[PDB]
Design a protein around this ligand. Structure first.
Ligand code: SF4
Lengths: 197, 61, 113, 65, 460
């Protein structure tokens, strides 16, 4: 939690950015190949330059990292808007997360994983604009959200407000699997998966 | 006449020229103008004070 | 050897996905540049990757072939060897520190004290 | 630390240079010249009704310390 | 033919010889004798830090004395004209008559500023007036000569086909025709400076500028790696010809950012990206680092070297003060004595600032920059525009920007195009070379030391 927080943060950021770019969910002209987005990125990845999407993804990754203590799976869904049906599913495994050094090696592992992801995405057919959108799904071990407001949650600072707005922003819910390479480093034991059709 | 017509604070020549004619004119101290007028060389200072007074006269119109 | 080189190349291409250059082969096998180019051509012989070739024309001119269909001044070409093999479309290499203790072909006149 | 100090110094120097340039082009109305002694003439503009003067003297005081 | 045919013709016919890797060819030794001799001219004390007028006076006096000596050497007594006798005048107001006369005095022109830079500076001043009114309110295009006693309109044809910038001292000699306007027949320039003798095995120098390694342009890193591989003798494979490049000279613009909105992280990333390239090029070929206008250093002309910091920690073996011939960080202007050949290099801020104005006379091409460089070399003044280029307190009683010894090659960088020009002034020989940027059209300049022949190397 001392240094894996920032590494997981930038990894999820690059993951979401590459997913949004290579699937044509947003116009590529709004993306630019950069290396610094308030954090040193391990590769020249295309990151968007829109304010709303920026803090949107920021708050999403912050909530994910806060819930990581009980989350063992993080999925990014890509669904159509004419029909609420899942078209693509990209899974990121967090098996025990190796929870409670050589940052260059972590960056190399992240670069290899991102290269594998890009190679997998390059084989997919072209995706059209006009409401081909995305969603977000998570899988926890033992947790319950949406019930922290039973006492009016009298606020006193920003931490409590953030906790409330994070615990209240989640709603309960209910082919060719292609595995990719993850991060085999000690502290960050991460696996990657993918789904189609 | 400017104070009776317009409603501003400084009521100076430069402020009026900037708020009415949209032209900002620099301002020099009296000692600097005297040192520029008594310079045997550096005709630039003489031309400067001449244009200064000519602009101050034309802004009055 | 043409056996360990192909093994290392396919490993660094499929297992640890990253673009491979002849410089890495020269540093790993401790061989010359022409031998590295010959090994790269042999590996190109006998396919899930993209080859990047460069051609050195006259007048000390160096360019990178992209279309691979319209090579200008084909008569003035003095050398043309495969430069790297990248599995992805975007080249975007990465560079790190290299210890050329014995893999240098040109040494400076001065030595580090 | 040193990099941040250098960045701040460069920003202050660029601000001072921009202020000197705009004041010189402003005094060009009188001197009708662009060479030397133009900044020397413009260095005496004490017009208290111009905000560029306050910024220029503040930058000068910051660079003198 | 196809790419496969060329590959089968080239790689299969490889010689695979001379690559012993145990007895490598040693690079040609090239030593800059100005490393430890004495008198670093552009090395100032940043702690020391208007003096512009004091500098103006000294420059004008030196120029006046030189012009007077040149007139005495050229317009000496007995230099009669066609019909009339030639005379001399001390004051500008003294020349009034149907007789030719020679006089010394500065030149004064309009030298208006560009509109692009006008709005560029206006957008960052927090409420400045319309500077466009300062140029449009006045009624322009005329050259005059000021000698502290008056001004005379220098009308003529020989002045039209010559470039001029205000502040230059000229000893033109003419005669009035019908008014207070003096004509011109010849134009005089100050006395020629002494030049070191050209020396009579020999190597070359690689000059590169305009790298602009940023966190947004990835093609710059690929071109940098290609240049590092080509200089290492791995691409061309002609060791007999590549080993003649003794050292590389980075003239400026290695890192490009907008100082308005930058943090320490981006600069550190760019410096570490440069550090790699440096660690790969250093143990093979020496390097000469020079700062620029967009480099993390002072914005004025005489820029001190960057620092001992701002590089990777693995480069500490080179910053030990003992290995200086391998890597030398020098000021922005420098007169390198490469094996007795005196070459002066500048970041190009002077020419870029001179071109930043719009002069309404003298009738952005390669010929224009070459003519401006030739005029700068003839005027013996590296910085013609004092307040836009020079900073406060440059020197005391002895300006460094005034030329005291003519060099063999004048190298300028940060230019849009590439070109060369051999100028002859007073029996001397000066070769001006314009170095282009490495980001766009990243050509490499190879300057020889035996015949002063410059060659180009394109990288795509
Ligand atoms: S500050 Fe003084 S000089 Fe600069 S513009 Fe305003 S008036 Fe002219």
């Amino acid at each position: 939690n001392r240094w894996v927080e920032k590494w997981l943060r930038v990894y999820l950021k690059c993951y979401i950015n590459l997913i949004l770019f290579y699937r044509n969910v947003y116009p590529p002209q709004s993306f630019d190949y950069t290396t610094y987005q308030s954090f040193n990125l391990p590769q020249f990845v295309p990151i968007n330059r829109h304010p709303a999407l920026i803090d949107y993804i920021e708050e999403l990754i912050l909530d994910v990292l806060s819930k990581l203590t009980h989350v063992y799976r993080f999925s990014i869904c890509i669904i159509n808007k004419k029909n609420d049906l899942c078209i693509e599913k990209y899974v990121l495994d967090f098996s025990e997360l190796q929870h409670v050094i050589t940052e260059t090696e972590v960056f190399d592992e992240f670069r290899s994983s991102l290269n594998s992801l890009i190679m997998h995405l390059e084989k997919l057919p072209k995706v059209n604009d006009d409401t081909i959108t995305f969603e977000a799904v998570i899988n926890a071990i033992e947790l319950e959200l949406g019930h922290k407001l039973d006492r009016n949650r009298r606020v006193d600072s920003l931490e409590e407000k953030a906790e409330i707005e994070r615990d209240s922003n989640w709603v309960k819910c209910q082919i060719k699997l292609t595995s990719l390479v993850g991060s085999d480093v000690g502290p960050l034991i991460i696996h990657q998966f993918s789904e189609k059709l | 006449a400017l104070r009776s017509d317009v409603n501003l604070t400084q009521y100076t020549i430069e402020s009026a020229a900037f708020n009415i004619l949209h032209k900002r004119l620099p301002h020099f101290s009296f000692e600097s103008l005297t040192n520029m007028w008594n310079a045997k060389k550096s005709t630039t200072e003489l031309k400067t004070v001449l244009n200064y007074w000519l602009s101050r006269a034309q802004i009055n119109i | 050897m043409d056996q360990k080189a192909s093994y290392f190349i396919n490993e660094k291409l499929f297992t640890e996905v990253k673009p491979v250059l002849f410089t890495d082969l020269i540093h790993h096998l401790k061989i010359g540049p022409s031998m590295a180019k010959k090994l790269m051509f042999d590996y190109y012989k006998q396919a899930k990757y993209n080859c990047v070739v460069i051609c050195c024309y006259k007048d000390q001119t160096i360019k990178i072939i992209h279309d691979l269909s319209n090579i200008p001044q084909q008569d003035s070409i003095i050398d043309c060897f495969i430069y790297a093999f990248n599995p992805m479309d975007s080249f975007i290499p990465y560079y790190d520190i290299i210890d050329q203790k014995d893999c240098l072909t040109i040494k400076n006149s001065y030595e580090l004290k | 630390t040193t990099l941040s100090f250098l960045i701040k110094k460069l920003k202050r120097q660029k601000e001072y240079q921009t202020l000197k340039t705009v004041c010189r082009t402003c005094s060009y109305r009188y001197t009708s010249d662009a060479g030397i002694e133009n900044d020397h003439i413009a260095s005496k503009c004490n017009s208290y009704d111009c905000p560029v003067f306050y910024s220029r003297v503040k930058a000068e005081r910051y660079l003198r310390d | 033919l196809h790419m496969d045919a060329l590959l089968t013709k080239f790689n299969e016919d490889r010689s695979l010889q001379d690559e012993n890797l145990s007895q490598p060819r040693t690079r040609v030794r090239i030593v800059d004798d100005n490393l430890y001799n004495k008198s670093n001219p552009f090395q100032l004390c940043y702690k020391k830090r208007s003096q512009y007028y004091h500098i103006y006076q000294y420059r004008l006096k030196t120029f006046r004395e030189r012009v007077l000596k040149e007139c005495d050497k050229r317009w000496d007594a007995g230099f009669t004209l066609n019909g009339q006798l030639v005379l001399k005048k001390d004051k500008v107001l003294d020349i009034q008559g149907n007789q030719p006369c020679w006089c010394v005095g500065s030149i004064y022109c309009e030298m208006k500023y560009k509109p692009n830079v006008l709005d560029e500076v206006i957008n960052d001043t927090y409420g400045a007036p319309d500077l466009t009114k300062s140029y449009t309110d006045k009624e322009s295009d005329e050259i005059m000569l000021e000698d502290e006693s008056g001004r005379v309109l220098l009308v003529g044809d020989f002045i039209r086909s010559t470039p001029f910038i205000t502040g230059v001292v000229v000893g033109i000699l003419g005669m009035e025709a019908e008014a207070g306007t003096f004509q011109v027949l010849d134009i005089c320039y100050p006395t020629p400076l002494p030049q070191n003798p050209f020396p009579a095995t020999r190597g070359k120098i690689a000059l590169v500028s305009g790298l602009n390694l940023n966190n947004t342009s990835p093609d710059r890193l690929l071109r940098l790696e290609i240049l590092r591989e080509f200089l290492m003798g791995r691409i061309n494979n002609k060791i007999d010809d590549i080993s003649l490049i003794g050292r590389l000279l980075i003239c400026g613009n290695s890192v490009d950012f907008d100082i308005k909105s930058v943090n320490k992280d981006e600069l550190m990333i760019s410096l570490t990206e440069f550090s790699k390239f440096l660690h790969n090029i250093l143990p093979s070929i020496s390097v000469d680092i020079m700062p620029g206008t967009n480099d993390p250093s002072d914005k004025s002309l005489p820029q001190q070297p960057f620092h001992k910091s701002l590089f990777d920690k693995s480069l500490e073996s080179y910053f030990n003060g003992s290995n200086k011939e391998i890597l030398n960080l020098v000021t922005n202007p420098y007169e390198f004595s490469y094996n007795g050949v005196d070459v002066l290099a500048v970041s190009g801020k002077n020419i870029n600032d001179i071109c930043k104005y719009v002069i309404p006379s003298n009738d952005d091409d390669i010929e224009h920059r070459l003519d401006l460089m030739e005029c700068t070399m003839k005027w013996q003044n590296i910085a013609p525009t004092a307040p836009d280029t020079l900073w406060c307190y440059p020197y005391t009683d002895k300006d460094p920007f005034v030329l005291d010894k003519w060099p063999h090659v004048y190298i300028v960088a940060n230019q849009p195009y590439f070109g060369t020009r051999v100028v002859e002034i007073g029996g001397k020989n000066i070769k001006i070379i314009s170095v282009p940027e490495f980001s766009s059209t990243g050509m490499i300049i190879l300057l020889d030391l035996e015949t002063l022949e410059a060659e180009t190397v394109k990288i795509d």
